[PDB]
Design a protein around this ligand. Structure first.
Ligand SMILES: *C(=O)[C@@H]([C@@H]1N=C(C(=O)O)[C@@H](S[C@@H]2CN[C@H](CNS(N)(=O)=O)C2)[C@@H]1C)[C@@H](C)O
Length: 245
């Protein structure tokens, strides 16, 4: 192409600078990792996965028959942080709304012993879930780097995780968040509010019209004041700058 790598790096860094945060976005083309943003050293640092863990929670629950894709988890009628959570939903709907109460129910059905075994089996992050089955992805001890998240997304996009093909396909259908002139973006967002500083994620992949999958993981510091949509806006501007969408 004609745009210098200096120009691309400067543009993407500026997206993070303009949002007044510190962050990175890692892109993988084939086996090659590229790191962009205004805080590149974040790439190999560990953070809690927060709601990004719902991807793996869903795979484990479906694989081990703790839920089906059409099962409706009923709202128990207790007040929730967000009104959109106060309703009955499938795993797929709960994935789109990041409804942690539904995924806490799923984690409790899986149980600590099986959860620890499966997280170990998948080799996810530091693989440490500790003794509380319903919050380990939110406040620790489970942590993962942006590099590990992009490689997770790569494995899921390519059906390479150690679950049935059908399990992987059912979860990937839950993750479609955007369609852009023939490209589809699959991703899960994360906003870890139970740690300091607070971490923001958007981890996923672009499926281009020709079938090629380009995984990415954005990771940044969320600060009170910020809108969740900054995660998507930075990601889309970055993939667009590089010509991926
Ligand atoms: C996951 O990381 C946390 C969860 N993820 C969120 C996200 O934005 O990534 C939020 S909740 C999400 C934003 N608002 C939607 C509901 N809308 S409404 N109109 O307010 O009912 C859902 C949240 C912090 C999770 C671990 O808590």
């Amino acid at each position: 192409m004609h745009i210098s790598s200096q120009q691309h790096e400067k543009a993407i860094k500026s997206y993070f600078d303009e949002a007044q945060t510190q962050g990175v976005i890692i892109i993988k083309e084939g086996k090659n990792l590229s790191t962009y943003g205004n805080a590149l050293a974040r790439a190999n640092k560990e953070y809690v996965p927060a709601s990004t863990f719902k991807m793996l929670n869903a795979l484990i629950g479906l694989e081990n028959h703790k839920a089906t894709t059409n099962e409706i988890f009923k709202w128990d009628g207790k007040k929730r942080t967000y009104p959109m959570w106060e309703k009955d939903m499938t795993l797929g709907e709960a994935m789109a709304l990041s409804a942690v109460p539904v995924y806490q129910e799923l984690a409790r059905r899986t149980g600590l012993e099986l959860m620890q075994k499966e997280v170990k089996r998948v080799n996810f992050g530091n693989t440490n879930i500790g003794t509380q089955v319903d919050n380990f992805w939110l406040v620790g001890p489970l942590k993962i780097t942006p590099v590990q998240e992009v490689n997770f997304a790569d494995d899921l996009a390519h059906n390479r995780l150690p679950f049935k093909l059908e399990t992987q396909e059912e979860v990937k259908k839950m993750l479609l968040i955007k369609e852009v002139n023939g490209s589809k973006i699959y991703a899960k967002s994360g906003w870890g509010m139970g740690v300091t500083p607070q971490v923001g994620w958007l981890t996923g992949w672009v499926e281009q019209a020709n079938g090629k999958k380009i995984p990415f993981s954005l990771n940044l510091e969320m600060k009170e004041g910020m809108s969740g949509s900054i995660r998507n806006e930075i990601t889309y501007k970055s993939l667009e700058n590089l010509g991926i969408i």
